[PDB]
Amino acid sequence: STGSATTTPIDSLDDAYITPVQIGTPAQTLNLDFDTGSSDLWVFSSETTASEVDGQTIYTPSKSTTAKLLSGATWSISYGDGSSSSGDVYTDTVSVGGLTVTGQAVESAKKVSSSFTEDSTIDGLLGLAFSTLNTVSPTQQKTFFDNAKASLDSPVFTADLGYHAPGTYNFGFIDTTAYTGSITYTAVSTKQGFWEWTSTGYAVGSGTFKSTSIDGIADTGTTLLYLPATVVSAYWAQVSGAKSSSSVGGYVFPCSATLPSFTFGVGSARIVIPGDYIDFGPISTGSSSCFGGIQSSAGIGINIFGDVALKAAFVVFNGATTPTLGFASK
């Protein structure tokens, strides 16, 4: 089997991407944030504290003839941005782009933190990291991809995120029309539960490529590109007037600037992020200070190849017995 679904930016800045997902019988379609950095499929629901729902579409398990309470199971997750959610668990039928998994754990939110409530466009998350990170207790549950894998034509999914435009998540096949050149594959460590890999270096604009190993994670659920402070300083030093602002929480730059590109290495191959992809717009409405799309990881503990980086590539998440990642230009 295969599946193919369009993923759409939630706003004009590509702050996140939503993909429609069918849950239950009859189908209830919710727009979920596909997140290769976590491993829970959780949704706003009829059980979510009413004051914490503000415009999201909810899953109502009582209206699904295939929903079954997973007795005794609870979940609770905290994300790197400080947001969180928790609740109980149903199993139900879940379909993405024509690919159907029966008995998928659907984690029903009883509580969500403010950033989730405040984002009316995101009805939940669909985790695509390794199932060892799944938070369901006392019986850990498998991700949608893990459950589908054996049925897929090939044990892979691909992320093709658009810049200010829709893109595609495919399951079970590699669309050879969706990229240019060849796909370069690179080793993955699953030791932390992430799609963790080592970039071979970087360049800023037309500058020379610096060969240096940068371990990080391919994370569709993180908006920006978080890299070591040395790398980030070298990038922003090429932008007149750019500075790190403690009050704003990162590098800002004059909105009048034209940003340089940023290149990252994948083995001997190179992925070029155009400068425009690094502009996240005014820090507040009407400001001439703009927020940068490349930020320091120094306070995180891990480097994160988020959407800013991934949207410049066609990315293969190869879930073979030994997982690997593939990157192609497009």
Curated annotation (Swiss-Prot):
Residue ranges annotated for the Peptidase A1 domain, each copy included: 17-328
Documented EC number(s): 3.4.23.22
Keyword Disulfide bond: yes
Disulfide bonds: 255-290
Reactions it catalyzes: Hydrolysis of proteins with specificity similar to that of pepsin A, prefers hydrophobic residues at P1 and P1', but does not cleave 14-Ala-|-Leu-15 in the B chain of insulin or Z-Glu-Tyr. Clots milk
EC class name: hydrolase
Record's keyword annotation contains Metal-binding: no
Positions annotated as active site in the UniProt record: 35, 199
GO MF term list: aspartic-type endopeptidase activity
UniProt GO BP: proteolysis
Swiss-Prot/TrEMBL keywords: Aspartyl protease, Disulfide bond, Hydrolase, Protease, Signal, Zymogen
Superkingdom of this protein's organism: Eukaryota
Protein family: Belongs to the peptidase A1 family.
Protein name listed in UniProt: Endothiapepsin
Species of origin: Cryphonectria parasitica
